[PDB]
Amino acid sequence: SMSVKKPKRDDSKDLALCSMILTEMETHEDAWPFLLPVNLKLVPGYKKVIKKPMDFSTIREKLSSGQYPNLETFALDVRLVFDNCETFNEDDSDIGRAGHNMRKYFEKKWTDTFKV
Ligand SMILES: Cc1cn(CCn2cnc(-c3ccccc3)c2-c2ccc(C#N)cc2)nn1
């Protein structure tokens, strides 16, 4: 509260660490469904169904341009990629399976990097 500050974690490295995580995600072999925004002409339904599109290239742009206030806002956009993927794709599809794999991959890096 006013004049009563909790010690807070050192956030000085967060930009570099998030960039590294993103690089790792961009180079994963299962990243192909997520590298660029979904093309609304090739993909019937995505426009109406997915209210907040997101993809790795949009995250990279936002990260490079100071549009994440903090590391949680970054993680929210990564998770949004995978949540949108699950909304739109059967678990059993190649893209569905890709999204599950990429989510697991991200979350371990997240925990390892910042929960420690
Ligand atoms: C780009 C692009 C390519 N395509 C057609 C192949 N495709 C079909 N569905 C998806 C999709 C749907 C939901 C969530 C993620 C991917 C895609 C697809 C979209 C983007 C990329 C990239 N990069 C690859 C495939 N659409 N946009």
Hey, which of 25, 34, 42, 43 would you mutate to test ligand 1's pocket, going by the most ligand atoms within 8 Å of its Cβ?
A: 43
CA 73 to chain CA centroid, Å, is: 9
* CA-based nearest residue to 78, from 51, 107, 43: 107
What resolution in Å is listed for this PDB structure?
A: 1.8
Q: Where are the domains of the chain?
A: 1-116
CA distances from 99 to 1, 21, 39, 45 (A): 41, 16, 18, 18
Q: What are phi and psi of 73, to 5 degrees?
A: -70, -35
Contact (CB, 8 A) for 25 and 106: yes
1-116 classified as CATH 1.20.920.10:
yes
State the CB neighbour count (10 A cutoff) for residue 72.
11
Distance, CA of 85 to CA of 64 (rounded, Å): 24
Distance, CA of 112 to CA of 83 (rounded, Å): 21
Q: What separation in Å is there between the alpha carbon of 83 and the centre of ligand 1?
A: 15
Counting Cα atoms < 13 Å in the Cβ hemisphere of 33 gives: 21
Secondary structure letter of residue 91 according to DSSP: T
Distance, CA of 75 to CA of 63 (rounded, Å): 11
Distance, CA of 69 to CA of 110 (rounded, Å): 17
